[PDB]
């Protein structure tokens, strides 16, 4: 009477129907309900996500050390969403955002809404008010840790010291998720690591996608290589990983990506020390090749094409 796979499929079906699609899924599964997504600005990361970018109407947490590339991403996400004619907001509580660099990553700063809250409650509240107006495609909250409660900011005491900030972030997400779904706005929370920062406790359970950003290399001193791990993903098989270069003053390196993904996917052969594409001499050294691809825009484009074809 028992047929495991048939039994298992009925279970999984019932599992998803009780808690939502993605509640449980095989790892090497392969996605085919394409969603709506905001390209991460990193081709590899987008693939790692399984859906070509950050899902819309979802809560995203991008945690990691400082200077590991979180912001560059989130900014790119913003820029992409704008090109698609979407409106963006930045709840800033760190006062660090460099708008000049932002423009360089393609963000139309002038049309970017910026807010600088007086308290964690206010910050979250301001963000909720914006979200449920349905005019936003994306909203970035800088620094989960800066969401310090009012009582704490204001004088208050050594008593009734509490874990108020976490509960602050819980109640907030509790009601701002439903809205995010209806609205369809993607909310990226930037969590600088140094509970994963007190409020990251609740974020951990409310995020549909959680990215673990790390600084790994240091491609002279041009820029540095980042590695992201999709530790949580309720919309595609989780745990995938991606890598990309962010040069100083520049955002995520396109050519860089292409050179990497092109290599691993065989489109560009890499005789040790010398990169070649369809018999073309690309140059010795990822950089001489990055350059090559930067200058001979025509190549790379066909290689971006070929790689895009082979995947999605
Ligand atoms: N204002 C800038 N000037 C020059 N390069 C920058 C600037 N901002 C970002 N970059 C580039 C070079 C940095 O090595 C790379 C990583 O920094 P960032 O992308 O800001 O890291 P991060 O997102 O992990 O920091 P944060 O803790 O604020 O999130 O981005």
Swiss-Prot record:
One GO term in the molecular function aspect is: ATP hydrolysis activity
Chief localisation class? cytoplasm
Null allele phenotype: Not essential in the absence of DNA damage, its deletion renders cells much more sensitive to DNA damaging agents such as UV light, ionizing radiation, alkylating agents and DNA gyrase inhibitors and desiccation-induced DSBs. 5-fold decrease in survival, loss of HR, no change in NHEJ (non-homologous end-joining) or single-strand annealing DSB repair.
Localization annotation: Cytoplasm
Cellular compartments per GO CC: cytosol
Query: What positions does the entry give for phosphate binding?
Result: 67-71, 192
GO annotations under biological process?
A: DNA recombination; DNA repair; SOS response
Q: Which InterPro entries match?
A: AAA+_ATPase, DNA_recomb/repair_RecA, DNA_recomb/repair_RecA_CS, P-loop_NTPase, RecA-like_C, RecA-like_N, RecA_ATP-bd, RecA_C_sf
- Give the keywords, sorted: ATP-binding, Cytoplasm, DNA damage, DNA recombination, DNA repair, DNA-binding, Nucleotide-binding, SOS response
For ATP, which residues are the binding ones?
67-72, 98-101
Family membership noted in the UniProt record: Belongs to the RecA family.
Quaternary organization: Polymerizes non-specifically on ssDNA to form filaments. Interacts with and activates LexA leading to autocatalytic cleavage of LexA, which derepresses the SOS regulon and activates DNA repair.
Q: What does this protein do?
A: Required for homologous recombination (HR) and the bypass of mutagenic DNA lesions (double strand breaks, DSB) by the SOS response. Can catalyze the hydrolysis of ATP in the presence of single-stranded DNA, the ATP-dependent uptake of single-stranded DNA by duplex DNA, and the ATP-dependent hybridization of homologous single-stranded DNAs. Numerous X-ray crystals have been resolved under different conditions which indicate the flexibility of the protein, essential to its function.
NCBIfam families, A to Z: tigrfam_recA
Tell me what this protein is called: Protein RecA
Origin organism lineage: Bacteria, Bacillati, Actinomycetota, Actinomycetes, Mycobacteriales
This protein's gene is called recA
């Amino acid at each position: 009477a028992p047929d495991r796979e048939k039994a298992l499929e009925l279970a999984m079906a019932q599992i998803d129907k009780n808690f939502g699609k993605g509640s449980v899924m095989r790892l090497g599964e392969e996605v085919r309900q394409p969603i709506s997504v905001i390209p991460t600005g990193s081709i590899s990361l987008d693939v790692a996500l399984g859906i070509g970018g950050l899902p819309r109407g979802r809560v995203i947490e991008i945690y990691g050390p400082e200077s590991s590339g979180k912001t560059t991403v989130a900014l790119h996400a913003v820029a992409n969403a704008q090109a698609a004619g979407g409106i963006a907001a930045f709840i800033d509580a760190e006062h660090a955002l460099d708008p000049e660099y932002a423009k360089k990553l393609g963000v139309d700063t002038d049309s970017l809404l910026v807010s600088q809250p007086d308290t964690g409650e206010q910050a979250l509240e301001i963000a909720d008010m914006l979200v449920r107006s349905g005019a936003l495609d994306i909203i970035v909250i800088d620094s989960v840790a800066a969401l310090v409660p009012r009582a704490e900011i204001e004088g208050e005491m050594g008593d009734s010291h509490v874990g108020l900030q976490a509960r602050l972030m819980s109640q907030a997400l509790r009601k701002m998720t439903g809205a995010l779904n209806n609205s369809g706005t993607t909310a990226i929370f930037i969590n600088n690591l140094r509970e994963t920062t007190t409020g990251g406790k609740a974020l951990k359970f409310y995020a549909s996608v959680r990215l673990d950003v790390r600084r790994i290399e240091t491609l002279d001193a041009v820029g540095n290589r980042t590695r992201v791990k999709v530790v949580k993903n309720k919309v595609s098989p989780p745990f995938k990983q991606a890598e990309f270069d962010i040069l100083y003053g520049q955002g995520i390196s396109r050519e860089g990506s292409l050179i990497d993904m092109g290599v691993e996917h065989g489109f560009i052969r890499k005789s040790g020390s010398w990169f070649t594409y369809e018999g073309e001499q690309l140059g010795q050294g990822k950089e001489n090749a990055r350059k090559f691809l930067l200058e001979n825009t025509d190549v790379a484009n066909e290689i971006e094409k070929k790689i895009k074809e082979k995947l999605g």
